[PDB]
């Protein structure tokens, strides 16, 4: 353990993702609310999750009767070095197939 | 670890209370709404967890 400095040695469930986050940014999208009684001028939120799995960014969107940001934003397409006919569509359809 | 075999031996961070399990309880409560409309018909959703 003296060895341990860089922050791929170790499995972050502590200190990512824990229990109440989500909470704290539905409530951030009650606080906007108030501003966007009026129409035309709805007040938009995104949230920018990187280095994630697919399950846990589409969290974000929120559920059918609790609203959260509109949507999260998407880099997966920003990650690909290499490009190719297989890697374009695992990307596109693996946003389509998870999100709600 | 041969020798772990009592529960109150462990820290039970990834068997209880993870998350979306709060999301699971706030859509039981959403499903009794449909049959709360009704005034004096109010339907009660208690949670036990000791």
Redesign the interface.
């Given at each position: 353990p003296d060895t341990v400095t860089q922050y791929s040695e170790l499995y972050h469930?502590?200190t990512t993702?824990?229990?109440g986050?989500?909470d704290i940014v539905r409530s951030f999208r009650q606080t906007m609310d108030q501003y966007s009684t009026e129409p035309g001028r709805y007040r938009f939120m995104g949230t920018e999750a990187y280095a994630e799995s697919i399950d846990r960014t589409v969290?974000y969107y929120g559920?059918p009767?609790?609203q959260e940001a509109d949507f999260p934003f998407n880099n997966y397409l920003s990650m690909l070095d290499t490009v190719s006919g297989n890697s374009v569509y695992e990307v596109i359809t693996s946003w389509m197939e998870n999100m709600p």
């Open positions: 469930d502590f993702t824990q229990v986050m989500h969290m559920l009767f609790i």
